[PDB]
Amino acid sequence: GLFGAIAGFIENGWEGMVDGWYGFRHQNAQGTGQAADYKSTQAAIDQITGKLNRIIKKTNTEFESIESEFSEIDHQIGNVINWTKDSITDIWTYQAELLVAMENQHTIDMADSEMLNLYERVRKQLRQNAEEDGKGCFEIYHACDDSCMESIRNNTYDHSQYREEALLNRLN
Amino acid sequence: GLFGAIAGFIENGWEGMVDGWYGFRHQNAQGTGQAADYKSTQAAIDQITGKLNRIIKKTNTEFESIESEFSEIDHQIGNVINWTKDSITDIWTYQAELLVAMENQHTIDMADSEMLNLYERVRKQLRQNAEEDGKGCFEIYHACDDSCMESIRNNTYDHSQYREEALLNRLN
Amino acid sequence: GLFGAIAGFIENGWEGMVDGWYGFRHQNAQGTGQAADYKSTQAAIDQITGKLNRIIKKTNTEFESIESEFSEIDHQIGNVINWTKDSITDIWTYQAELLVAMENQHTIDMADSEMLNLYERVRKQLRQNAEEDGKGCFEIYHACDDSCMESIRNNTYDHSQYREEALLNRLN
Amino acid sequence: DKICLGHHAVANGTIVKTLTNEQEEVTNATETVESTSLNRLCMKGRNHKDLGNCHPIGMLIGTPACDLHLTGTWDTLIERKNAIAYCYPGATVNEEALRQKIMESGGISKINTGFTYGSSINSAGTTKACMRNGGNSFYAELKWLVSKNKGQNFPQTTNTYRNADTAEHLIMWGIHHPSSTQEKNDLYGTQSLSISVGSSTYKNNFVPVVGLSRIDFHWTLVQPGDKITFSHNGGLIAPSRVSKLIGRGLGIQSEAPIDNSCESKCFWRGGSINTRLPFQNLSPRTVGQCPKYVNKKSLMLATGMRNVPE
Amino acid sequence: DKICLGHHAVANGTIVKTLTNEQEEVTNATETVESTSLNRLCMKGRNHKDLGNCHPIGMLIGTPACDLHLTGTWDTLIERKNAIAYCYPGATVNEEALRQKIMESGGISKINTGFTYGSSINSAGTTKACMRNGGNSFYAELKWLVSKNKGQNFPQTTNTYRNADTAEHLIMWGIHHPSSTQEKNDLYGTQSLSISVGSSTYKNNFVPVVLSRIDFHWTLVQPGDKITFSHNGGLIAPSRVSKLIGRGLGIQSEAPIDNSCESKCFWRGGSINTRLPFQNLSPRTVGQCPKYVNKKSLMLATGMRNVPE
Amino acid sequence: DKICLGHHAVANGTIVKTLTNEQEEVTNATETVESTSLNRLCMKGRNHKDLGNCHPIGMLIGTPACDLHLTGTWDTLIERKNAIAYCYPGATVNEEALRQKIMESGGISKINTGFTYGSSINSAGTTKACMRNGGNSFYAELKWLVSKNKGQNFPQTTNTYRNADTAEHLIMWGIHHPSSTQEKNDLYGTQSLSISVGSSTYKNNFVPVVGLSRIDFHWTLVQPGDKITFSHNGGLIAPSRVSKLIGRGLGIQSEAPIDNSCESKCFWRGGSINTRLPFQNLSPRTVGQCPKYVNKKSLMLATGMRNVPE
Ligand SMILES: CC(=O)N[C@H]1[C@H]([C@H](O)[C@H](O)CO)O[C@@](O[C@@H]2[C@@H](O)[C@H](O)O[C@H](CO)[C@@H]2O)(C(=O)O)C[C@@H]1O
Ligand SMILES: CC(=O)N[C@H]1[C@H]([C@H](O)[C@H](O)CO)O[C@@](O[C@@H]2[C@@H](O)[C@H](O)O[C@H](CO)[C@@H]2O)(C(=O)O)C[C@@H]1O
Ligand SMILES: *[C@@H]1O[C@H](CO)[C@@H](O[C@@H]2O[C@H](CO)[C@@H](O)[C@H](O)[C@H]2NC(C)=O)[C@H](O)[C@H]1NC(C)=O
Ligand SMILES: CC(=O)N[C@H]1[C@H]([C@H](O)[C@H](O)CO)O[C@@](O)(C(=O)O)C[C@@H]1O
Ligand SMILES: *[C@@H]1O[C@H](CO)[C@@H](O)[C@H](O)[C@H]1NC(C)=O
Ligand SMILES: *[C@@H]1O[C@H](CO)[C@@H](O)[C@H](O)[C@H]1NC(C)=O
Ligand SMILES: [Ca+2]
């Protein structure tokens, strides 16, 4: 993908995450857990809701009948109606196919970008206490219990508290 | 946004910066300063000028009247013209809505990316002499006077001149 | 461009690389080498092939004649046909100009994205054994022979094997 | 030790088209082209008039089938298949043009012409074809003019309508083209027949020619403050009232059952199209405020990320 | 020490629509739909013609109201409301087609038909419906042909015009439909009346009807081709034919003219001077115009997201 | 030790337009607008008919130039410039409506009308204007009816044809308009001439004028079951066979030569258009399944990355 996370360095999605769109999975001495990220999920959903509100519409123009259903009409002008209606129908089919293809591309890449922005936000707050494994995870170089894991998820992790343990662990 | 800088990890814009779109704010022993980046500002403006040059355009097709203003047209021909004209107006209204909507989406995300590209250019230039604070600033682990700050902006900051000092202060 | 690599931090392309779109150029004790990356090359080609399949097409709609080539037609209905055809042409000319401009912009930025995704993949492989020089290259801080270089390209590089040698050279 | 980031997924996804891939799998997707249709003409909040087997032209001339629709107002006017316009066989000149005007109108009101004929003339010629109230009859808004005496020829006559209104008035009339000369001599005599119609914006002569016979209709528009003169001597089917079309309204041509308990804005032959979606697969021929017709079975719009299942 | 990267912002940003958000705030924006119009016809750099009282068809047949507009050249032709085509009662067959054809031309010139009639025909038939210079008159480019002695039979006569020019010529004639048989007989005699018009391109027969009116008919005559009129009372014969010259823009508007302003787009209400691609004044426009749209405003972002302090 | 990432480049790149840039150099691009066509009609896999010198109306009346095209089936009918419809001076009323109707069809078949005339009526009238096989002849599908003795009055005769093929038949007749009165008196006598055509659908009257001669043609559709009655006393050019238009076909009007050694689905005055490209700037007037016309010389679609050389 464009931002290279979903179908990218993250190998696959999690079918066991029903409570959100993006989220975290941890591993410490206390055990293993899962938790959805609310802001990034809703950022993606609110963007898709906006697409639907714009696309799911019709025109308020009143069109009257120019072709008769139960009788014949002049051959010369009836051909002109047929040419015109076919030409207009080609345009609307082309615009419909183009609209949907373009939006689908943007939706897929937008969703990928929201995954990347959460990964980068975690990267920067972890600072020098963690390293990237290349699969969407961060190998943390200090004893991070379930309270420390929640501070990462909620953006209240202070790196300088754990820095000295991490710098020692990483260098040897 | 898509690239996570504008309305992303950078908390807000600067109304004080009037001489550019993107720029720097430094803090050192000597004091405080602010300077705008020309190249990234001009990259964003040129791209937006290009859009305006493409969109602010009329077709040079010379159309003639096909409905009399001061006279009753034939009823059969007039219904067809009314159907045709209203179908054409629905297409152009739809195109104009989608054009502007699509282009505004691009303009925002384009400007988002020019910020990020400047941010990345600085990150790689500072190398191991600095660390990201997670909100669009770089904490520099050596004495960086106004000429050193100048050299970062001008893209002439040599990392190896301050590398020995910086690693000692980073490890501590 | 959007992702900041092609015509960005990578200063220019390689006319020498004819066997692929993206690739590697290394330097070690042994000498130099060059190799194309299949994965990223084919991702860019397949996406461009996909565009051509959708764009290089026509509608299957049968259009019959309404303007007579040899005999004349009423001047009023002739002008109604001329007005309708010119209106439909202006739409298709606009849609064609828009399509191609939109797609070209997407193709250029997509190709830029595949370049960055390769760069980021290699950065995460190398982990703490190398540093970014700012111009698309990684300075690897240990003797890396052709087989070591091959494993970086093949995605079988284990950073653990060279870590202790690397951190000693990096810190000095 | 480790903290990982990831995204949701499903087992059974759905395929959508993108710019670069005709088979791209996503977690969820919704339709943009409507396939289904309601075959009930939804007419809530609409002052409508279902004609039944009455043709729109029939209510101007006054067919027996169009007895409940001579006068009225409406915003919608429904037309049906095989609706009888003419009880007595024949056809109107410029028939389709006339039908359009009536279907686009939002009402019909009648005005008396005020024609009266001499002692020789009999303006009450009934027929076996047009029958109302269990007996022989004729077009309600027209009068078959014939001689009262069977041998005697039809007298020279002149009738003149005057439009006293500020709006244009629609005036119709028929011409009897007899089957045999024995029949022509019985009704209008041996004399040579000649019908002249004359106004400020219309001039035309109508010479008659030779199981039952036929009556071909004609029509025109009498402008405000103008007069239309019918000079004749046998054959003319003169009007007793004229028509005025009121306002504007939606003319629907359909065959579906009517329904007053639901509302709608788009209509076609098979029914009414109620949907919030932008595109439609049912028919190119619709009326009202409609979704746009497209040559596509389905266009799925992605409402979720790429599906990358385990 | 610290170095912080950031972007500009403004106090008062503008709302724009994106694909994903209807109420998106950006630093600057610009309008794409033109909503205002000049209530004027902008005729700078245009050799124009204001017909005023004259209707386009009246230039060909030659109504008194069109005496100043029988001949000339132009790149723009302006027609007004309640313009006079006919002085005497009647109309033209394929009227709108003929009107549009004149409103596309860049001029009209006249050529003499040279038609001559015998001593027993009065070629100078006038009327009180068509007034000019005090006394009774008739269409300047036509001639009302009647019998010189009242009641006498109009003689069988033949007139043929040949197109000696290298461009096509437009010829018009009228067929008088009298009020009564008394009038028919006094002007054209007791005989039956046939008028035949024929050429390589065109062929038609006309039979007068019997209150009074002159209905008009017309056709084109190609270079070198002959058009022949065979008649015996009823024909309003042309004394001149018309050649439509080049091309020009036809405007139908009541708005006044201004020669200091220039424009390439026009409508009933006036002119549309705008570099903008779209427009919401009228769908009925002429010339090189922005495309009509059913929208009051569409704002194009000329700047990043506005994220103020 | 150093490993560098990079992309390919080319010496000569092509310029394309993007949303932001009119002059954007890329590694490769491909054209989307076709500006060249074959100067030939590509008729492979098409049961086609090239009319050549024959005009479509002439194939219904049987002009000598159309002898090879009186009957046939096709999916493509090709009309040419300056094509002959009439061997004898005249023209058809509602001409262009008929030509369109024939060019829309996918074949033609004749049905013999059958009706005969009296011994005093000569139905084998010919002319030097309409040559066939050396000697004089006439429109193959019609009969010129004149009096057998010069000066004798043409009998009052009534011809009738019934439709019994479960499909509408196209019927054509002609009306002679004599040059002088002596000519009119030689063929049809001194009597006053009057031709009446009457069916359920059609009804009209025709009268010869007097002013070498000409024959105007008229036409209408006879519905299945319905009859059409011609009553006349001189001047009628009556049909021998009526016509039946079969199905549907693609009408082409072009000057370009035929080529049966290649296929195409799009045609215009100057030839065929065989492109796979979506757009085209050859002509707005095209027929068949075509690329859409645009006012553009070239639109380059990029098939490669931005080109950043040396
Ligand atoms: C060429 C010619 O005969 N001109 C007449 C003209 C026409 O004959 C008439 O308009 C055809 O309908 O009629 C003119 O005026 C006439 C009066 O002189 C007469 O008293 O009453 C007539 C009506 O029955 C008619 O109005 C005219 O229109 O000026 C005289 C003109 O020379
Ligand atoms: C059916 C018939 O009468 N055919 C005649 C034909 C017609 O009478 C004529 O086309 C009607 O206008 O005329 C033909 O040739 C004639 C000569 O034989 C005659 O000497 O001169 C005539 C002219 O004055 C005329 O040209 C013809 O067209 O071939 C003879 C044909 O039998
Ligand atoms: C419709 O448009 C066509 C051209 O696009 C007009 O045809 C041209 O007419 C001019 C006369 O000014 C000729 O010189 C050209 O040779 C014609 N071109 C073609 C391709 O036929 C046509 O006149 C227009 N219709 C009307 C009613 O004005
Ligand atoms: C007014 C009049 O005379 N009406 C009679 C007509 C006409 O004579 C013919 O229709 C003329 O063609 O004939 C009838 O059999 C009919 O068909 O209804 C009976 C009817 O009483
Ligand atoms: C117009 O299209 C309809 C539907 O395909 C067809 O039945 C009809 O014959 C066409 N009309 C003409 C005049 O060819
Ligand atoms: C076409 O639309 C105009 C403006 O809405 C209206 O005045 C006119 O009546 C319509 N024409 C016909 C023939 O219905
Ligand atoms: Ca034109």
Tab-separated table of N, CA and C and ligand atoms in Angstrom, chain E residues 88 125-128 136 144 146 176 183 187 212, ligand 1:
chain	number	residue	atom	x	y	z
E	88	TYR	N	-48.319	43.191	-42.570
E	88	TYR	CA	-49.581	42.557	-42.966
E	88	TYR	C	-49.727	41.227	-42.203
E	125	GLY	N	-48.854	46.648	-55.910
E	125	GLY	CA	-49.956	46.522	-54.955
E	125	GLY	C	-49.503	46.881	-53.549
E	126	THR	N	-50.180	47.849	-52.928
E	126	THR	CA	-49.828	48.355	-51.593
E	126	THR	C	-50.928	48.032	-50.575
E	127	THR	N	-50.701	48.387	-49.310
E	127	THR	CA	-51.686	48.159	-48.242
E	127	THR	C	-51.523	49.155	-47.088
E	128	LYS	N	-52.608	49.347	-46.335
E	128	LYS	CA	-52.631	50.252	-45.175
E	128	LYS	C	-52.088	49.601	-43.897
E	136	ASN	N	-49.654	54.490	-48.239
E	136	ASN	CA	-49.698	53.022	-48.251
E	136	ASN	C	-48.500	52.439	-48.994
E	144	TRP	N	-46.532	42.760	-54.518
E	144	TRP	CA	-47.887	42.197	-54.545
E	144	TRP	C	-48.417	42.297	-55.973
E	146	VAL	N	-51.256	41.764	-58.655
E	146	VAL	CA	-52.711	41.671	-58.856
E	146	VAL	C	-53.075	42.066	-60.289
E	176	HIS	N	-50.590	34.824	-51.108
E	176	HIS	CA	-51.763	35.524	-50.575
E	176	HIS	C	-52.969	34.583	-50.490
E	183	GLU	N	-63.175	38.911	-53.110
E	183	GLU	CA	-61.828	39.490	-53.098
E	183	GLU	C	-60.897	38.752	-54.066
E	187	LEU	N	-59.193	40.514	-57.561
E	187	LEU	CA	-57.734	40.656	-57.673
E	187	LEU	C	-57.112	39.709	-58.701
E	212	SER	N	-58.008	37.767	-44.306
E	212	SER	CA	-56.918	37.912	-45.281
E	212	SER	C	-55.548	37.775	-44.614
G	1	LIG	C1	-53.095	44.961	-53.603
G	1	LIG	C2	-54.457	45.307	-53.075
G	1	LIG	O1	-55.469	44.835	-53.566
G	1	LIG	N1	-54.460	46.150	-52.042
G	1	LIG	C3	-55.665	46.628	-51.373
G	1	LIG	C4	-55.878	45.801	-50.102
G	1	LIG	C5	-56.182	44.315	-50.346
G	1	LIG	O2	-57.059	44.128	-51.465
G	1	LIG	C6	-56.818	43.654	-49.121
G	1	LIG	O3	-56.140	44.058	-47.927
G	1	LIG	C7	-56.773	42.138	-49.221
G	1	LIG	O4	-57.432	41.579	-48.080
G	1	LIG	O5	-56.937	46.384	-49.320
G	1	LIG	C8	-56.794	47.762	-48.918
G	1	LIG	O6	-57.976	48.248	-48.258
G	1	LIG	C9	-59.263	47.730	-48.628
G	1	LIG	C10	-60.271	48.875	-48.567
G	1	LIG	O7	-59.968	49.836	-49.586
G	1	LIG	C11	-61.703	48.368	-48.742
G	1	LIG	O8	-62.616	49.451	-48.562
G	1	LIG	O9	-61.983	47.344	-47.782
G	1	LIG	C12	-61.137	46.194	-47.908
G	1	LIG	C13	-61.574	45.126	-46.908
G	1	LIG	O10	-62.737	44.449	-47.396
G	1	LIG	C14	-59.674	46.588	-47.691
G	1	LIG	O11	-59.474	46.969	-46.323
G	1	LIG	C15	-55.679	47.898	-47.898
G	1	LIG	O12	-55.451	46.936	-47.128
G	1	LIG	O13	-55.021	48.961	-47.839
G	1	LIG	C16	-56.535	48.623	-50.161
G	1	LIG	C17	-55.381	48.077	-50.997
G	1	LIG	O14	-55.210	48.867	-52.178
